[PDB]
Design a protein around this ligand. Structure first.
Ligand code: SF4
Ligand code: SF4
Ligand code: F3S
Ligand SMILES: [Mg+2]
Lengths: 534, 267
């Protein structure tokens, strides 16, 4: 029964945006892969000539999943271009909103985007809720009873019996599937928590609106700082703190135990979807002008040599277009970037994506939680090391297990747990600063006629950079280089497969009509195609 | 996907940032789980649906051709330049997708400024020829209810759907096809800083003591006076809205706002 031939997955669902994955399968395993991004908007074109202050409002609309991140990147970029050093409180507030964004984003990713690749929701109906409650209570300090889980099962039963399966229509697990491994009880636990997560994420997102006006698409950042005087008040700080505390409890008591029980069941997934090279920009600064002041530090690793972490040199980024739907074949550093669309259809002139192909010293780089976690670990980050070691010990695996689809998925949880705790540290520092009498949240600045600037964010999917050339006080060039561009962009002019493409080689496919194994790997990267293409 | 029982919703993603879908996930009383399990049957939605690829395409066909009928909710502008090729799903242009599906809907809701008016990708110079749904599909007689904002308040989507299900008709709509029950007042007339506006008490900069004191943000670009939305009344996430966070309104529920309301920090 081992399939040889093409498989196309278009649309890839349970991502942001519009992705087409093409693979060639030989004897039931992937031999080749293409990552094809099928929507272009052209925000970089639209920005030309505009007021640099307006950029963050446009670029935030790159993406509403990773909402705020692009506003933050553009504001850091214009801050940098004008040379303003924003007040300590603006750094704290900006960092706290970003921390909250990571928690919201990663919880929704695991449950609402990734878990249907691993959880058979309909098999939860077969479960013994008393058995399921015992298992749930064994993995978490949160106690769950039989009745708790029966209520979920009863709701699900009504839903399934109506014949209107809604989002579960034609799921790859319906009827059973040989690549789905969980027992009924573990499916019931995960399904219960999927549903719970639908309401918890409301609170996680609300935490961003406390200081940030609203979610999606915050409205509190300006060149020079932030606008939210109300964020200094004890009432708003208490409101934020309460939402953060409840969010953190869910991370610690529900998400991570679920992540571990699922990973333990799918331990074969340590064997697929590895990558070679990693890049990360660092995040949560003390000093807006020093990446090494960030709680996570930047770094670059080639060929998994974590004993030799290289410094990040921003001048070594170039974005390729040879296999992309843009004019020509010349890679460009983003301060000399070009966005000149030219469509040739799928594989026309060997071009197959609206994403550019960023390369660092010519190499394809994974970015995102696995890069952030592995580089921080290797830099001796104490919190990342403690959490990572505990996860590895629980799973009974060695560190080599991290270089995989499972590894990547685990690293997303690790980072969520570490960030959840660090938000409390930042919060306390913020409170302390206010208590010293520092009530300043915005600094004055002046627009230069000519300048270059760059802003760096390590976003939930990795290293984000926005690049501006100011000419006559206006946007002369504005280039976004986005984490999913790095990870899911196409081949470069050296024909090097991108991280997602390379990671798919070797993927087994049990059933070519229901290629969940491809989704597992693709989803592990948490693709954002609106981000990647803009 | 659906059969009798709950009303079927087909949710489409065109040229979008997924911020409007995220806004629906923030639904409050009712929450999104009640909406998906009890109120409606969400029969196609690329962000959260289980099926992918061919299986997702079959799910969409099954929903669209149901004899029970469906409601379409549309996120994103439709790119029309170069015969639609700037946006494709399952290798069909979004223009083609929407041209085939939306005329079959019992009702269409354009959700978010992109779907209603073209939005961010339609801002000058509009390289993909992005259009709002009713503009793009005028020739097919599509008249979507426009729920504007970037993203809109999800209260406004749910309220519109509830109304439609109860009354079997659209609520009163304004001249931009937006429900007057949500879009009938300017942001400004509802704003707590209106007494400062009337007194000509404006913050001259974000760092100023006047900004600290909560003075009016008009001199810093606030487009509240020319923007129709319910933001000050409903707020977002049950807790805040732009001007209460100290930042001007950027006009995000208005057509062409990216070009009409810019520069955002001037009036
Ligand atoms: S209206 Fe705004 S939030 Fe909604 S899809 Fe368009 S850009 Fe995104
Ligand atoms: S802050 Fe904006 S909406 Fe409020 S009173 Fe001033 S101009 Fe009007
Ligand atoms: S920017 Fe948009 S969200 Fe409301 S306050 Fe202004 S209409
Ligand atoms: Mg770019």
């Amino acid at each position: 029964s081992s399939y040889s031939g093409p498989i196309v997955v278009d649309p890839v669902t349970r991502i942001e945006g519009h992705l087409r994955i093409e693979v060639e399968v030989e004897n039931g395993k992937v031999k080749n892969a293409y990552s094809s991004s099928t929507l272009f908007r052209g925000l970089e074109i639209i920005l030309k000539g505009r007021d640099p202050r307006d950029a963050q409002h446009f670029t935030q609309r790159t993406c509403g999943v990773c909402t705020y991140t692009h506003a933050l990147a553009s504001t850091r970029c214009v801050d940098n271009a004008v040379g303003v050093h924003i007040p300590k409180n603006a750094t704290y507030i900006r960092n706290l909103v970003l921390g909250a964004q990571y928690l919201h984003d990663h919880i929704v990713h695991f449950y609402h985007l990734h878990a249907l690749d691993f959880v058979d929701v309909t098999a939860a109906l077969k479960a013994d809720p008393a058995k399921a409650a015992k298992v749930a209570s064994s993995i978490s300090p949160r106690k769950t009873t039989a009745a708790d889980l029966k209520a979920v099962q009863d709701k699900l039963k009504t839903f399934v019996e109506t014949g209107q399966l809604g989002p579960f229509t034609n799921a790859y697990f319906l009827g059973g599937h040989p690549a789905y491994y969980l027992d009924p009880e573990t499916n019931l636990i995960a399904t219960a928590h999927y549903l719970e997560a639908l309401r918890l994420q409301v609170k996680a997102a609300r935490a961003m609106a406390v200081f940030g006006a609203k979610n999606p698409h915050t409205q509190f950042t300006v060149v020079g700082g932030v606008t939210c005087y109300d964020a200094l008040t004890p009432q708003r700080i208490a409101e934020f703190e309460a939402l953060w505390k409840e969010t953190k409890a869910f991370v610690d008591e529900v998400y991570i135990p679920d992540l571990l029980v699922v990973a333990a069941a799918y331990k074969d997934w340590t064997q697929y979807g590895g990558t070679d090279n990693f890049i990360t920009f660092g995040e949560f600064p003390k000093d807006e002008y020093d990446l090494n002041s960030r709680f996570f530090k930047p770094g670059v690793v080639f060929k998994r040599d974590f004993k030799n972490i290289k410094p990040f040199d921003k001048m070594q980024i170039e974005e390729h277009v040879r296999h992309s739907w843009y004019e020509g074949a010349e890679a460009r550093h983003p301060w000399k970037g070009q966005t000149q669309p030219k469509y040739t259809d799928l594989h026309g002139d060997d071009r197959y994506s609206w994403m550019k192909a960023p390369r660092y010293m010519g190499e394809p780089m994974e970015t995102g939680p696995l890069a952030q976690v592995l580089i921080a670990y290797s830099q001796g980050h104490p919190k990342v090391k403690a959490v990572t070691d505990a996860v590895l010990a629980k799973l009974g695996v060695g560190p080599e297990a991290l270089f995989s689809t499972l590894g990547r998925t685990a690293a997303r949880g690790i980072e969520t747990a570490v960030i959840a705790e660090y938000v409390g540290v930042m919060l306390q520092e913020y409170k302390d600063n206010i208590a010293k009498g520092d009530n300043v949240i915005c600094a004055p600045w002046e627009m230069p006629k000519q300048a270059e600037g760059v802003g760096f964010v390590n976003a939930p999917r990795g290293g984000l950079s926005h690049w501006i050339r100011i000419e006559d006080g206006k946007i002369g060039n504005f280039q976004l280089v986005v984490p999913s561009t790095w990870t899911l962009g196409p081949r470069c002019d050296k024909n090097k497969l991108s991280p997602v493409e390379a990671s798919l080689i070797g993927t087994p496919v049990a059933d070519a009509k229901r290629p969940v194994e491809i989704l597992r790997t693709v989803h592990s990267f948490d693709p954002c195609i609106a981000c990647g293409v803009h | 996907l659906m059969g009798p029982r709950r009303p079927s919703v087909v949710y489409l993603h065109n040229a979008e940032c997924t911020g409007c879908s995220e806004s629906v996930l923030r639904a409050f009383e009712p929450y999104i789980d009640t909406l998906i399990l009890d109120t409606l049957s969400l029969d196609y939605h690329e962000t959260i649906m289980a099926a992918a690829g061919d299986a997702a395409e079959a799910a969409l066909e099954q929903a669209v051709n149901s004899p029970h009928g469906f409601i379409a909710v549309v996120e994103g502008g439709i790119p029309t330049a170069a015969n639609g090729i700037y946006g494709k799903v399952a290798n069909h242009t979004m223009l083609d997708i929407c041209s085939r599906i939306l005329p079959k809907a019992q009702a269409v809701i354009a959700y978010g400024t992109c779907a209603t008016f073209g939005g961010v990708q339609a801002a000058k110079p509009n390289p993909t020829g992005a259009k709002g749904v009713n503009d793009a599909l005028k020739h097919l007689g599509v008249k979507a209810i426009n729920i504007a904002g970037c993203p809109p308040n999800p209260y406004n989507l749910v309220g519109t759907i509830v109304y439609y299900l109860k009354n079997k008709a659209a609520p009163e709509l304004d001249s931009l096809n937006r429900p007057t029950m949500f879009f009938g007042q300017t942001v400004h007339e509802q704003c707590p800083r209106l007494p400062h506006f009337d007194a000509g008490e404006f913050a001259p900069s974000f760092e100023s003591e006047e900004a600290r004191k909560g003075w009016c943000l008009y001199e810093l670009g606030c487009k509240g006076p020319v923007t129709m939305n319910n933001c000050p009344k409903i707020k977002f996430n049950q807790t805040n809205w732009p001007v209460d966070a100290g930042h001007p309104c950027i006009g995000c529920s208005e057509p062409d706002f990216w070009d009409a309301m810019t520069p955002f920090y001037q009036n």
